[PDB]
Design a protein around this ligand. Structure first.
Ligand code: CL
Ligand code: ZN
Length: 160
């Protein structure tokens, strides 16, 4: 078992409280088998709503997968109490937004897609259904009379 933090960085414009929303939120990841090193060929996602009870007091997992190359049964779990928003004050800094407990599947890449939400920095205008798949996003806050944006989204992994 190991924990891994996923840190986001983005440039924010007139936006705050940027966060994944809901138990159905999808963390799209490329995952590495911890025994044979095989990295998934396609993006896979994991979500809190898929939680499954592991046998024999081992706890739970968000995803269990038998490695196709070495037959190990590996798992990974999103830690829900570690999910944090990315705020106006975090602008352009890496910041941990979620942690995963890894039992033989470890993420080595991350693709933010849909399901994020955020709000106008002063207006509190709600923006939902934000898709970051392009790594840029723009909209207009009518209450603020300002453009809002999230640009140059990137990430990195910290082993905890
Ligand atoms: Cl998947
Ligand atoms: Zn393997």
């Amino acid at each position: 078992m190991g924990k891994i933090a996923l840190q986001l960085k983005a440039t924010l414009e007139n936006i705050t409280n940027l966060r994944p929303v809901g138990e159905d939120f999808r963390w799209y990841l490329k995952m590495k088998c911890g025994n044979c090193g095989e990295i998934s060929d396609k993006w896979q996602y994991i979500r809190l709503m898929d939680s499954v009870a592991l046998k024999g007091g081992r706890g739970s997992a968000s995803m269990v997968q038998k490695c196709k190359l070495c037959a190990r049964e590996n798992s990974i779990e999103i830690l829900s109490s570690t999910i944090k928003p990315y705020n106006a004050e975090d602008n352009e800094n890496f910041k941990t937004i979620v942690e995963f407990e890894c039992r033989g599947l470890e993420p080595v890449d991350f693709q933010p897609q849909a399901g994020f939400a955020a709000e106008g920095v002063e207006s509190g205008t709600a923006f939902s259904d934000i898709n970051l798949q392009e790594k840029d996003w723009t909209d207009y806050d009518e209450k603020a009379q300002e453009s809002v944006g999230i640009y140059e989204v990137t990430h990195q992994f910290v082993k905890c």
